[PDB]
Amino acid sequence: TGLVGLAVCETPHERLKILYTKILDVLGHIPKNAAYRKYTEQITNEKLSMVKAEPDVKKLEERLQGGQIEEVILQAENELSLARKMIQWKPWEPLVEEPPASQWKW
Amino acid sequence: XXXXXXXXXXXXXXXXXXXXXXXXXXXXXXXXXXXXXXXXXXXXXXXXXXXXXXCDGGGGALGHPRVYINLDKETKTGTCGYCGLQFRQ
Amino acid sequence: RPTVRPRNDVAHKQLSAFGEYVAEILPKYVQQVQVSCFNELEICIHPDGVIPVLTFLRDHSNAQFKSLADLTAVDIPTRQNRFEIVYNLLSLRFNSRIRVKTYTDELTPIESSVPVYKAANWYEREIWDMFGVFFANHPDLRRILTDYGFEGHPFRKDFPLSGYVELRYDDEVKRVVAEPVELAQEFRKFDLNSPWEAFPAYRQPP
Amino acid sequence: TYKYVNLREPSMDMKSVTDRAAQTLLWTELIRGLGMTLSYLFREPATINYPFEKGPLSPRFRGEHALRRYPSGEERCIACKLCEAVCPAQAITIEAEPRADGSRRTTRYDIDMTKCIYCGFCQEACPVDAIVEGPNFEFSTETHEELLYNKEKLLNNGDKWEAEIAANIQADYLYR
Amino acid sequence: VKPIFSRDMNEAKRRVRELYRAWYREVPNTVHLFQLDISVKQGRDKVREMFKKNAHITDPRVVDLLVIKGKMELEETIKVWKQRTHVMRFFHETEAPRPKDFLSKFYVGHD
Amino acid sequence: EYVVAKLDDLINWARRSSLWPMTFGLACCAVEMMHMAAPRYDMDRFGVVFRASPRQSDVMIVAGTLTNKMAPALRKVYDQMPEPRYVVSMGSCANGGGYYHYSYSVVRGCDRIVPVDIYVPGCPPTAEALLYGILQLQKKIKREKRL
Amino acid sequence: ELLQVLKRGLQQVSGHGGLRGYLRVLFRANDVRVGTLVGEDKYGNKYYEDNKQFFGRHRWVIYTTEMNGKNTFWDVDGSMVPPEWHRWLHCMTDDPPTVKPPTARKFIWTNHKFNLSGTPQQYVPYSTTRKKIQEWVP
């Protein structure tokens, strides 16, 4: 069995569990008062509970993905890169940038 | 009617002492047959019974929007906007 | 209504949740104005950070967009800030269309979308061609739709439709194709604009 | 919906391997591909020689422009500038003056064939049905000057096609 | 500051100098590789008259955009691109050309 | 005296027999030019051969729209052509810019680049009408070199 | 089966003309075919139909010898044939002299004209406006 995409369908469990536990710590380094940490954490914790309850079932892969484990692993792989870029460039924690000129209607 | 060489059609001038026209020399210039609107006056005027009459070319098949023409004055017969056809009484 | 209405609003409140969710982060660096009409979402972005907005929506746990496919730009001389580069984004996993806009005049350079999106570099060349907006830290900025001996930027509303260099003769010189000739046929400028306002609610008080 | 293009290993063991190898060792499928054109050669070709035979058409077809007139003389074109503004190529030009006394129907009427992308828009926008698109193919010139149509005249010379136009418009009122 | 462009005031002037050297070396090379056309000396005179029209310098924002454009229209020869003595030719060949005088232009009657 | 007049027609008959056109895929017109190959309307081996080639071809069909980028490109093709050359401007774009015209990029007329002998007016130039362009070309060749 | 194919070709050559008639449909005409003919048109035009053969085909039709003043039999374009192009030629089902009659209005030309071409008496452009008048007199 193999996925349709170029990413190889490898039989690996708990691989999703490592990456989802890693990203939670990165979020709790610099932003704390920001809403970015407060909202993303509760989605990841909801997804981690489904992995712990269901043992290698296709129904667990069907939850919020429905394209096997290979597509879900790609969602976790770029999550660490997105969290590190959000930690490096301050945007979520700080808001002080100038407002636009008053015009919008065409 | 023709002036010098070239024939006038639908009110058109040829050339003032031959200056503008030069291309139409080897090839013969076009001319519309009976473009003087002589066929407009050739058609006989139809008698009307009502005070206002509706005009049509030939129903919905031929392109003519319906216009009502008033007949009140004895002198000068009324004609529709699209046709040269005149109506009396 | 049976033929008069296209579709009734039902997903409008569902799409309005996105108008709150991204705004719940609340950056002055990113958010500014959020507009939602006719089953579609529109966001305009402050010039200082465009790349951090594009790294968002890419991946992300709540919404997965990935494809930052089609890229347009708007020329408008009404505002003090001229150009408006408009990103059209599409999701495959989520099935939704969101819009990313820029508000800056951008005669001065703007940040590129090449590190986030691969096909973005080809569209970025078109904006430099037609509009004349330079992208900072861009790999290979080359002319595509413009001529090799073309002056200015062909789309800008400041100059005519015919242009300055357009007519190309051959005549006297054996091989050299002409350029400096400028005359063209008369394009009839239509002044057709209807009296009375077209639609209510769209009217703005002076 | 899913349909799948991949065969996923047609050969398995012994019998299924040999026939998949036989088509690559010699040819077979090339000889089978040879037979496709073989029967295609025998069946009669659908060919039309133009100077004698003519191809299929329709009651409504757009070609070279020609302006129609009323059955009892009179030019049907009323001069509106209606067809002028609709024209996406801006091929049609119209300047109007009063005809002698009373009537007001045209003076300048040029349709460019250097322009004109053929829409039937001018046929549709016309309330009096002046420009009706006739079944035309024959038009070939030496110059642009000979190609672009003059002040009516050559358009009025469409009388040779107006007999067909009158037949075609009878299939046009209350559309098809 | 805002907005960056590439250089700040004095640094923008030296970017033009680097651009001038790259284009000065190509005009002898674009005779044998391209075509003879006019002259090597006359081609170098075409360079000086081009920079005279651009010579204003009030803000580095305007100068920086001219460098990017200068590394494009003058780059249409270095990496070998098709023109066939039609593109990248700046000088008018068929120009009349008109003059600015109240006796020369008024005799022809224009505007 | 009689042999001189009859031999001239024999050379003109050679071009009346076969004409090799250039396959320019620069248009929507080019898809209608591919309908000349389509069996229902054919000049294929009636006169037209789709081998083309920049040097061996006698005819070149300028298919539709030409931009200022293609203006030096199409000119050098015309120079590579042999002395008995005929140029057909098939399509309204080729005749003088059917659409666009007043646009900055599109070259008006084609005759500003390459001189035209036969004009075909049609946007989607119907294969029926396209058959005239080749038949008129064959008819136009009447007399060449008297002295 | 084999004998019927050879006999069908012999009947076609014997029907249309004979020895001189078959050569006119072979050398001048691109394809030789026999069937029902209307034979009613302006000048020397025949216009035949009713033949099955293939879909979207209405017999040989045949070009006219000396249509107006061309005086050509070897080479002829689609300049020939009067108002019948939208009739039995391609579009309509009814034949022009058999069922569906052409409408009379005394505006249409009685004699059919050929193509303009590069020959004299062809198409031309013409000015329309009388322009802005200017006059000076002693």
Add this chain to the structure above:
Amino acid sequence: KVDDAKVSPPKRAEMKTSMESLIHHFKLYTEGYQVPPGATYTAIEAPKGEFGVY
């Protein structure tokens, strides 16, 4: 066509008799549509890909 005559031109038999039809025929041609203001993006599946009209 759409029965509402502010978008699509009415029938040829209809416009010749009734009044409002021909005035709308006069204004749907020459003059455009009088469109509602706003930016919209549509994409319908092309066999090549998409036509993302904006």
